[PDB]
């Protein structure tokens, strides 16, 4: 079976004030990301997932994701002195051969990256368009919606199967399998506390505190196996009306999901894990023990390490609640820290920090998350209704 690959994952090496030219190449094997322009070129029509994560320092940041010269998605994060922030966004977009996609500052150019600080930008082909009707059928169930009881997202980035109901805010599973979900909320005016529901219960929680003159960005993502007829949605969670979700002409709060691996009987290549902290050790892997998904057992709870058992391209994402103390983590691959994520903590201001990257892995490769340096910046937080999560999945197996 031919595998359709087109993916890139890059980072800033310099912060600069125009398309943002990422020049740190995590992955770009098809060479479909052009480093001299910062633009991704579509060579294969289909449904593409894009995600970015920016270190906010010194000055506010506002960026927009462009698809062939139109602003599709906006992400705003205000900076306060002595308070480094983390802003992210993600969305599905269907692309035609020729479409180009990039990121630029919507000044608010507070993007930052140096020798131990990353701002990254990643995209991959999820579903290629199935010529009429050639080769491998593709199982599709996906949605990507934005804000304009379940939270009713009405702005439609993608809903081609209509498995998401815009009048109720609910996604309905029509195809049994492993689903990925992600959200990104701009926090303004009031605190934001949300919860990802599955059927009838809160699976995941994300809290982000709002201080005056400090718009924030909060995100979450998880892997959930679904059976036909059960649904998923995002609901404001708490008892203090933590509903400071925001959106306007050029500010988004989004909710995205997609079938990753469909269920089969006796071939699909599956290697995935999604785990969370159940509370809060220097120079050692952070051990996430709450298990959302770990079907192949490729993630080892007892060591906190992911082991590659199928060579190919992997996507990793994490989301961390920042409380009481600065948080800085490094993503390791095979005893080398690949990616760094820093988020300062200010009193009475819980924060949300995240990163995600594509990494090609071979047999023996281990991936894990570790607190940075001497392990001092360990303000990671989790409890009965606050999450810090680590997720990874096999995207394309080597052929
Ligand atoms: Ca912060
Ligand atoms: Ca902020
Ligand atoms: Ca906050
Ligand atoms: Na944040």
From Swiss-Prot:
Biological-process GO terms, alphabetical: adiponectin-activated signaling pathway; brown fat cell differentiation; cellular response to cAMP; cellular response to epinephrine stimulus; cellular response to insulin stimulus; cellular response to xenobiotic stimulus; circadian rhythm; detection of oxidative stress
Site (Not glycosylated): 117
Residues in C1q domain copies: 1-131
Post-translational modification: HMW complexes are more extensively glycosylated than smaller oligomers. Hydroxylation and glycosylation of the lysine residues within the collagen-like domain of adiponectin seem to be critically involved in regulating the formation and/or secretion of HMW complexes and consequently contribute to the insulin-sensitizing activity of adiponectin in hepatocytes. O-glycosylated. Not N-glycosylated. O-linked glycans on hydroxylysines consist of Glc-Gal disaccharides bound to the oxygen atom of post-translationally added hydroxyl groups. Sialylated to varying degrees depending on tissue. Higher sialylation found in SGBS adipocytes than in HEK fibroblasts. Sialylation is not required neither for heterodimerization nor for secretion. Not sialylated on the glycosylated hydroxylysines. Desialylated forms are rapidly cleared from the circulation.
Keywords recorded for this protein, A-Z: Collagen, Diabetes mellitus, Disease variant, Disulfide bond, Glycoprotein, Hormone, Hydroxylation, Obesity, Pharmaceutical, Repeat, Secreted, Signal
Activity regulation note: Polymerization and secretion of adiponectin is inhibited by succination of cysteine residues by the Krebs cycle intermediate fumarate, which leads to S-(2-succinyl)cysteine residues.
Expression sites by tissue: Synthesized exclusively by adipocytes and secreted into plasma.
Subcellular location: Secreted
A GO cellular-component term linked to this record: collagen-containing extracellular matrix
GO MF terms, alphabetically ordered: cytokine activity; hormone activity; protein homodimerization activity; protein serine/threonine kinase activator activity; sialic acid binding; signaling receptor binding
Domain of life: Eukaryota
Domain topic, free-text comment: The C1q domain is commonly called the globular domain.
Associated clinical condition: Adiponectin deficiency: An autosomal dominant condition characterized by very low concentrations of plasma adiponectin. Levels of adiponectin are decreased in obesity and may contribute to a chronic state of inflammation that leads to insulin resistance, type 2 diabetes, coronary artery disease, myocardial infarction, non-alcoholic steatohepatitis, and kidney disease.
Subunit text: Homomultimer. Forms trimers, hexamers and 12- to 18-mers. The trimers (low molecular weight complexes / LMW) are assembled via non-covalent interactions of the collagen-like domains in a triple helix and hydrophobic interactions within the globular C1q domain. Several trimers can associate to form disulfide-linked hexamers (middle molecular weight complexes / MMW) and larger complexes (higher molecular weight / HMW). The HMW-complex assembly is also modulated by the degree of lysine hydroxylation and glycosylation.
Note: HMW-complex blood contents are higher in females than in males, are increased in males by castration and decreased again upon subsequent testosterone treatment, which blocks HMW-complex secretion. In type 2 diabetic patients, both the ratios of HMW to total adiponectin and the degree of adiponectin glycosylation are significantly decreased as compared with healthy controls.
Summary of the function given for this chain in its UniProt record: Important adipokine involved in the control of fat metabolism and insulin sensitivity, with direct anti-diabetic, anti-atherogenic and anti-inflammatory activities. Stimulates AMPK phosphorylation and activation in the liver and the skeletal muscle, enhancing glucose utilization and fatty-acid combustion. Antagonizes TNF-alpha by negatively regulating its expression in various tissues such as liver and macrophages, and also by counteracting its effects. Inhibits endothelial NF-kappa-B signaling through a cAMP-dependent pathway.
Protein name: Adiponectin
Organism: Homo sapiens
Section of the entire sequence shown: 108 to 244 of 244
């Amino acid at each position: 079976a031919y595998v359709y690959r087109s993916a890139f994952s890059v980072g800033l090496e310099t912060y600069v004030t125009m398309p943002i030219r990422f020049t740190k190449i995590f992955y770009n094997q098809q060479n479909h990301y052009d480093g001299s322009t910062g633009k991704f070129h579509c060579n294969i029509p289909g449904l593409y997932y894009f995600a970015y994560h920016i270190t906010v320092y010194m000055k506010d940041v506002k960026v927009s994701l462009f698809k062939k010269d139109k602003a599709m998605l906006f992400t705003y994060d205000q900076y306060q002195e002595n308070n480094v922030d983390q802003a992210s966004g993600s969305v599905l977009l269907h692309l035609e051969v020729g479409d180009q996609v990039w990121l630029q500052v919507y000044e608010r150019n507070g993007l930052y990256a140096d020798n131990d600080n990353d701002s990254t930008f990643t995209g991959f082909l999820l579903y290629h368009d199935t010529n009429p009707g050639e080769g491998a059928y593709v199982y599709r169930s996906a949605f990507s919606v934005g804000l304009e009881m379940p939270i009713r997202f009405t702005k439609i980035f993608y809903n081609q199967q209509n498995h998401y109901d815009g009048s109720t805010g609910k996604f309905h599973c029509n195809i049994p399998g492993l689903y990925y979900f992600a959200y990104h909320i701009t926090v303004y005016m009031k605190d934001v506390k949300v919860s990802l529901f599955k059927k009838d219960k809160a699976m995941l929680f994300t809290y982000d505190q709002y201080q005056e003159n400090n718009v924030d960005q909060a995100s979450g993502s998880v892997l959930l196996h679904l059976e036909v007829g059960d649904q998923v949605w995002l609901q404001v969670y708490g008892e203090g009306e933590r509903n400071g979700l925001y959106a306007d002409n050029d500010n988004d709060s989004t909710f995205t999901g997609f079938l990753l691996y469909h269920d089969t009987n006796p071939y699909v290549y599956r290697s995935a894990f999604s785990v969370g902290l159940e509370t809060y050790i220097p120079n050692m892997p952070i051990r996430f023990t709450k298990i959302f998904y770990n079907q192949q057992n490729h993630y080892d709870g007892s060591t906190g390490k992911f082991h590659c058992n199928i060579p190919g391209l992997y996507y990793f994402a994490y989301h961390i609640t920042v409380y009481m103390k600065d948080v800085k983590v490094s993503l390791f691959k095979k005893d080398k820290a690949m990616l760094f994520t820093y988020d300062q903590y200010q009193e009475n201001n819980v924060d949300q920090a995240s990163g995600s990257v594509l990494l090609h892995l071979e047999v023996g490769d281990q991936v894990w998350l570790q607190v940075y340096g001497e392990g001092e910046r360990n303000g990671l937080y989790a409890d009965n209704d606050n999450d810090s999560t680590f997720t990874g999945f096999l995207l394309y197996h080597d052929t």
